[PDB]
Amino acid sequence: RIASFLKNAWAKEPVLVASFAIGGLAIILPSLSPYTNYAIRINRATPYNYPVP
């Protein structure tokens, strides 16, 4: 039945619905992506400061 009032809210306040959708998905998703480990890694690679010998 809990699925049913999604039809209701989707009928009633769609804006807010899409909002919760992507709003939560943006939190759950990122851990899943492998590229994240590269993503931090890239910022290890670039050296604003000099590499002292």
Nearest distance from C-beta of residue 9 to other proteins, angstroms: 13
DSSP reduced 3-state for 41: helix
Task: Spell 22-37 as b/e; 16+ CB within 10 A means b.
Answer: eeeeeeeeeeeeeeee
- Give the gyration radius of the chain's Cα atoms: 21
Give the residue with the Cβ less far from other proteins, 4 or 31: 31
Nearest distance from C-beta of residue 24 to other proteins, angstroms: 8
Nearest distance from C-beta of residue 45 to other proteins, angstroms: 6
Give the residue with the Cβ less far from other proteins, 3 or 45: 45
